[PDB]
Design a binder for these strands. Structure first.
Lengths: 50, 81, 120, 126, 96
RNA sequence: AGACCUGAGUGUGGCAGGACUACCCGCCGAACUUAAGCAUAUUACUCAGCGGAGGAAAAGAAAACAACCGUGAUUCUCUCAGUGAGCGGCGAGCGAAGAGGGAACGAACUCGUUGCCGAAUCGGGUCUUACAAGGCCUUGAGUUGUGGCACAAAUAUCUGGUUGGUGCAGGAGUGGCGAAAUUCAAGCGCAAAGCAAACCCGUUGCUGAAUACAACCCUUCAUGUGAGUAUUGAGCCAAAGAAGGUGUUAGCCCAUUGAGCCAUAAACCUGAGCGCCUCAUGAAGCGAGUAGCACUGUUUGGGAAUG
RNA sequence: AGAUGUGGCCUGGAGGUUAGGACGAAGCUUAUGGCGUGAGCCUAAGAUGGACCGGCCUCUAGUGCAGAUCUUGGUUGGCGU
RNA sequence: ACACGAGUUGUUCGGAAACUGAGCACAACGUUAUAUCGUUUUGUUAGGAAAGUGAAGGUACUGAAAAGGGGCAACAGAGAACCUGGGAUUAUAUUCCAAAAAGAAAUUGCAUGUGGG
RNA sequence: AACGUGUCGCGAUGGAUGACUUGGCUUCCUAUUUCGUUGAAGAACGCAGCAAAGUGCGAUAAGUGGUAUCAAUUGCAGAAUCAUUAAUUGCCCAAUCUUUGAACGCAAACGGCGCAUGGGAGAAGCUCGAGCCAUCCCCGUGCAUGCCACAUCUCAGUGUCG
């Protein structure tokens, strides 16, 4: 819909930023574990209800 | 048709986000946080679920004002001379 | 990172040891000619120290120690090297306890250490 | 660019810090523009020294202003009107606790009889 | 007053107007409509953006259109008066 | 007019509010279960609910036990004692107390009352290096009573202290920092391995079944063994053999391991640490909707009734 | 069904004792045989492995699997249906 | 899908500032071992002193008048001052366009100037 | 013959066993060891030259300050140039500490709206471009309720009095 509180708009603003993939260099840190981002998301599944 | 069919009759939301508890437990028609009891002064904790109390414990957050005072108390409130 | 009895606290406090502890922990022995002069059994390695490898497969190499990589528990020397697949050279790291300090760089807080170590 | 060594800041007058504070920010906010269109990395990695310098200038202005008011409140007539923020913060209980004087208040009798019969060192050895 | 600390009074502009945008349609607003674009403090008024553009760049802004990106950052299209050239102040900063 | 009493408004100074909740303390409070059924009983004065606090809480300074040659605050442990107690469809089951051996313990005090005093009190200003346990002042509170003195550890009321306040000093524990000893020698698939059968001989003698092994057999070229924390020999440190690190199994490669060294807001501890100014100081009664008592309900081993 | 016996077999650990191991430990695989009535043991080979470990006396227990519409992970015929 | 850049423009559009409705429950009061309970629009809280406004008059005093505390609940009710044109876009527009605004208006606040009182 | 069965040699699918262990559980001891209206616990957003999560931190945001330490950090780039006044890391005395929550000016699916009070900005107007500055905008502090003390304040009562 068009309506939204602004407080709710930001929560989706944050969650849009967090969907980016794991940087390529950060795999190369010495003693590194993280490979691909495990918290990624797609609106088609697991819907935020904010 | 208590169904798949009537499962698509579900419209709107009975619970929205809350200010303190931060969950989706805030009831709208009347106004409460089903989890954080907001707006009661005292929070909501029951001893019939202890698994639940330990998601509300003093530890789980950032403890920002615990980290400082515990350091003052341990150091006995030092000051410069 | 002190040795304890418990080996679970020892290995933990050893590999979680911060930088400065990792400076002490990785420290080479220095040659007899530098034990005579300063009367000291061993010192922690600094950047520019000139140093000889006793320990292995490079045994007998001599180099200047480019830099001390404290995160990998390793020292990087000069003239201790390997070529990659593509032909460039990469510094092969060596652990300090396997290496010997022939000539050590001197600065004013590094001297205040050698005065402070003196057995005599 | 670069930074402002902290021994130099404690020496300067307030207006000379405010005068200098801004012109670090103007050189920061001109570096924010360089993060958009990128060239010079050498110029781009200079953003830390300017942030912490501005962190360093404000550190002095605040400890000075915080210092001057603690002096500004000395005379007991001028005490108890001092801001809550300047008063020394102790744990909520310690600040409300009985002070070592007020817990030691002894009745006029208790003093007479603790003088008449003081505790006394002795040895029964021989 | 119980706040103490320090208020700079010359910095209130630098907090409002942050880095300008180089995006393709921000560069078109420069040549044609005589406007800039700035990521602005998401808390800012239109009146403030008008004032802090008079402080920083010494150019009067006849019209401001605020917006809030889906990202949370608050864009602004500042139209600076026709006595002023927005292609002038742009190269005074960037741009290309 | 004004006062007093009762009750409002505002300013000034502060506090209660939530969190934590293992233990602790008040109230509320079940059923599953056991009884081979089930209702009193049991599970249980427990789980769940409500309220509150500490670093412990609660208790406590005899309206106590005992019946003795008598014990002497409270708490806690052993034992009393799963009891020749007692409670119980006297069924299932339940179940203490005093004494004794011990832990602890400088352990005690002040109000009310009575008697003598009678604002000597408290707050607020100000002054003394000081919101002094001080001086001065003050219808501001207070005589509808603050305070002083004595009551059994008693038996007359008019040098000492660092626990009265001020400003200076030192050592000490506590925190943090730093601070030992001693190693080589033999080179490679095969002796960088053995044997001489308690100990001694042995600080000596002897020597090699690996001419390797590498896949149907034989032959001919080719190729192959990371690091010595191992072995052998020699040597050394031990008020340090500690057990972690390192390319293999490390007292001697490293870190540790230990007498001691420097640094130090206040508190803390020491001839109640030690000086200085002011400041102090050696006849009468004894707790009232209380104790009891009746009814009811509850709880307890507490029975014609423990709370 | 049940009772008991065994100087009776196996397993993780603790007190002892005696040994092994980079010239290859545990683990693993085998038309590898040998021993025991048996639980099991032991040797051989690995063109397996890469660092631990065996015997014996005693102590000790979260100590022996084929079945519970057993639990978890995997796989599988049905089926290129 | 995935990856990398970009995209949501308002004095007037919707909401809010500022309506009331079925209703809700803060204060107040009363209960409860305990508020985490009840009352709280039939014109309206509270055994209940909840008005901080100021008519007329005297020069920031004097006191007529007003009974019944605070707030929320409507993106379909009430209320609301703007319209088309476009070559203005890869994507927004009754939102953007700048001196010939492509232009034409409406309305709120304050202010000076001329005209009147 | 084909399918199918069986044995062996190798190979896949699958991830067991052992070896490894900065984890868990439980027992024990030490102490100037116990949060909050001086805004806590929990919640939300943010911050890094490059930064999704996590950790740290709060518009001074991957940290400021002070001491101790004594040349790094390190995936990459960047950076005063060794006598400490600019490495790092630990520790802590001085700081900063957004939006919220008992949450407390009023509200709330609103980054909304106040009343006092100081302060800032102000291209109109006035003033001779400086100075002032209406409306608008912005910022700091105070303002919940109950209670206690107080002021030597302002009042109420056919309560008791003169």
């Amino acid at each position: 819909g068009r309506f939204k509180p602004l407080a709710v708009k930001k929560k989706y603003a944050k969650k849009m930023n967090q969907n980016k993939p794991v940087p390529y260099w950060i795999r190369l840190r010495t003693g590194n574990r993280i490979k691909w981002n495990e918290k990624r998301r797609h609106w088609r599944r697991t819907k935020l209800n904010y | 048709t208590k169904g798949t069919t009537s499962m698509g009759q579900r419209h709107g939301r009975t619970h929205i986000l809350c200010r303190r508890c931060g969950r989706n437990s805030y009831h709208v028609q009347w106004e409460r946080c089903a989890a954080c009891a907001y707006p009661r002064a005292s929070r909501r904790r029951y001893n019939w679920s202890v698994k639940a109390i330990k998601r509300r414990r003093t530890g789980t957050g950032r403890c920002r004002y615990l980290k400082v005072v515990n350091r003052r108390i341990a150091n006995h409130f030092k000051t410069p001379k | 990172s002190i040795k304890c009895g418990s080996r679970r606290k020892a290995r933990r406090a050893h590999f979680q040891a911060p930088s400065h502890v990792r400076r002490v922990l990785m420290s080479a022995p220095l040659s007899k000619e530098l034990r005579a002069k300063y009367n000291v059994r061993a010192m922690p390695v600094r950047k520019d120290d000139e140093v000889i490898v006793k320990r292995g497969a490079f045994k007998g190499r001599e180099g200047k120690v480019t830099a001390c990589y404290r995160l990998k528990w390793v020292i990087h020397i000069d003239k201790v090297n390997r070529e990659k697949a593509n032909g460039s050279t990469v510094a092969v790291g060596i652990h300090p306890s396997n290496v010997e300090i022939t000539k050590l760089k001197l600065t004013h807080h590094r001297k205040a250490i050698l005065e402070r170590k003196d057995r005599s | 660019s670069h930074h402002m060594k902290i021994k130099d800041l404690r020496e300067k007058s307030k207006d000379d810090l405010l005068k200098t504070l801004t012109e670090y920010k103007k050189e920061l906010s001109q570096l924010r523009v360089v993060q958009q269109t990128g060239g010079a990395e050498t110029r781009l990695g200079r953003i830390r020294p300017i942030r912490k310098s501005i962190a360093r200038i404000l550190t002095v202005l605040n400890q000075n202003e915080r210092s001057n008011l603690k002096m500004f409140y000395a005379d007991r007539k001028l005490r108890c009107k001092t801001p809550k923020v300047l008063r020394a913060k102790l744990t909520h209980r310690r600040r409300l606790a009985l002070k070592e004087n007020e817990k030691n208040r002894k009745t006029s009798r208790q003093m007479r009889q603790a003088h008449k019969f003081p505790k006394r060192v002795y040895a029964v050895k021989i | 007053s119980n706040r103490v600390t320090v208020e700079s009074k010359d910095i209130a502009a630098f907090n409002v107007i942050r880095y300008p945008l180089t995006t393709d349609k921000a560069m078109k607003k420069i040549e044609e409509n005589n406007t800039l674009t700035f990521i602005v403090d998401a808390r800012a008024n239109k009146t403030e953006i008008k004032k802090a553009i008079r402080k920083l760049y010494q150019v009067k802004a006849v019209k401001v259109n605020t917006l809030i990106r889906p990202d949370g950052l608050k864009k602004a299209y500042i139209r600076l008066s026709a006595a002023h050239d927005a292609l002038d102040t742009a190269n005074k900063i960037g741009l290309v």
